[PDB]
Amino acid sequence: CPHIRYAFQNDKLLLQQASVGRLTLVNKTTILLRPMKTTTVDLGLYARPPEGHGLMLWGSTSRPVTSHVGIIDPDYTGELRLILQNQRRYNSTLRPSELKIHLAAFRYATPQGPINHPQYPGSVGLDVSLPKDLALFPHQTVSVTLTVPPPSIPHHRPTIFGRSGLAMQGILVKPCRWRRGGVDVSLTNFSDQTVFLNKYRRFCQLVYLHKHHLTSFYSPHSDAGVLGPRSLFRWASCTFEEVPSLAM
Ligand SMILES: O=c1ccn([C@H]2C[C@H](O)[C@@H](COP(=O)(O)O)O2)c(=O)[nH]1
CATH class of the missing domain: 2.70.40.10 (Deoxyuridine triphosphatase (dUTPase))
Structure with a gap:
């Protein structure tokens, strides 16, 4: 390096x-x-x-x-x-x-919905879209499964991370590996307001770590x-x- x-x-x-x-x-x-x-x-x-x-x-x-x-x-x-x-x-x-x-x-x-390229080029992660509407009540965790496998990249491992926009609003994603069988992604709302995230909203990002x-x-x-x-x-x-x- x-x-x-x-x-x-x-x-x-x-x-x-x-x-x-x-x-x-x-x-x-x-x-x-x-x-x-x-x-x-x-x-x-x-x-x-x-x-x-x-x-x-x-x-x-x-x-x-x-x-x-x-x-x-x-x-x-x-x-x-x-x-x-x-x-x-x-x-x-x-x-x-x-x-x-x-x-x-x-x-x-980087591979060439629900997995999307951000419109600015050499960004690390790909946007992942919500498969369903979610209501995130204050001080609670909500989980959602992603079942359809992302593209496979030799010598790399798909992971899920959050983005800073939702983080600023009090919604954190717990980072995790996206293994072949699927991944359960957990969102936690640390704010005092109920956050409604609609189907198709970007809610996390896919990163292929070596x-x-x-x-x-x-x-x-x-x-x-x-x-x-x-x-x-x-x-x-x-x-x-x-x-x-x-x-x-
Ligand atoms: O915790 C963070 C996450 C991101 N960024 C900067 C670097 C990223 O390239 C940019 C955009 O981050 P996202 O919106 O993709 O999370 O903000 C930070 O300063 N702190």
Whole structure:
């Protein structure tokens, strides 16, 4: 893997380390999560993955807070943000050091409804459409099955991730592998309002990760937070290169 070029400037976050292909930031100040509302951390982080790769952005905490897992497109030159939701019905705080924020690369592939190309080219994921109307009540999870197999790509593995638009509205998708038998996709509404998602609405994205990026082995090179403990995410072995001019 060629270098991941990045810029980072944010007095409220500490760069812990950029090691073995993963950059990790930690919060230096208390982050308040109001209940029933989205909390968005503006990271002051900018990054460009090498050829053939996308970037994975995720948060880790032992507190009752769930973060959106972000898929970062190769063409994205804006600021990276972490989107957080509160699991509780009262204020939850992330005290200093309680939130870790990770960025790492992965190889992906692209096949040529319900699986759709986004209208902007070299994007990592393909939009997946809802097969039925769903009503998502506050602080509840709703699941839906996708049964028809996606195209098979040699040496790659279809996965499902959420998108940031619904995440901002309080709706998170739990990332998961789309195995041959079908996938049950779970949507959780962390807001106080009922969200009605209609049949055919895009509700998640399909990403083909190179098979090397999924492992059962725990190590400083993998993380169970992303897609869960069965399918550990093992990022590409890239080097981070600071390029200050990327900061906007
Ligand atoms: O958690 C995230 C997810 C995405 N993005 C940026 C990079 C993506 O290329 C772009 C669009 O994301 P989606 O709307 O496809 O999720 O927003 C973030 O900053 N944080």
